[PDB]
Amino acid sequence: QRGIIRSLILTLDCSEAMLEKDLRPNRHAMIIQYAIDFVHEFFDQNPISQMGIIIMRNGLAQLVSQVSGNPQDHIDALKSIRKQEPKGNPSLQNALEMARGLLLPVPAHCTREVLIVFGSLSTTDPGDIHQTIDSLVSEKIRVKVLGLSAQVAICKELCKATNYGDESFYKILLDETHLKELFNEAVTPLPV
C-alpha cells in the first residue's frame, strides 16, 4: 500500500508432523500451495514491502529465501521446498533467532513481522526460548502464529508477549478455507 514498508519473515513448519495426510495430499504440500498464493497477494498489496522465508526442519531453522521485495525469489524458494519431505523436530527458538538476524539489519522505520505456520505439538529448542522472546519484545518484532488444530502454550505466550498482551495473534485453522482467510488477513497491514 506504499504508505507502510513492511518486513515479514514467513516461517514454515517443515518438521515431521507435516507428513500427516489429514490435510491433502499432506499438510506440507497444502501450506506451500497457500504460501505461494500469499506471496503473490502480499506483494501485489504491499508493493514496497519485503519478505524473507525460513523453514523449521531437522531441529534447525533454514533460510530458503533472503529478504527482498521480489516475489519470484520467494516463489522459487517455496517451489524447491515442496519437492522435499518434511522431517525431524521443529524449533521455534532457532527460527525466531534467525528471524532476528534477518530483521535487525533492516532500517528501523519498517515494520518487523514474523508469520509462523505451526503444525506441531511442541518445540524442541537448544536454549531458553523466553530469553529469545524478551529480545523480540525489546526490538519490537511482532509474531503471529497460524496453528493447525491443537493448542500449544508457548505459541499462545509468544504471540501474546510480542503483541502488547493482545491474545488474538495466535490463530487456529482447521481447514484450507480458514487458512486462505488467515493469509489474506495478513496481506493487510497490522493494526497499531
How many alpha carbons fall within 13 Å on the CB side of residue 187?
20
Instruction: State the alpha helices, DSSP H only, in the chain.
Output: 27-45, 71-81, 92-103, 129-138, 153-161, 176-187
d(CA 160, CA 149): 18
Q: Which CATH number fits domain 1-192: 1.25.40.10, 3.40.50.300, 3.40.50.970, 3.40.50.410?
A: 3.40.50.410
Instruction: Name the structure determination technique.
Output: X-ray
**Ranges of each domain in the chain:** 1-192
- Is the CA virtual torsion 43, 120, 112, 53 positive or negative? negative
**Cell numbers at 169, concatenated:** 495473534
How distant is the alpha carbon of residue 98 from its chain centre? Answer: 12
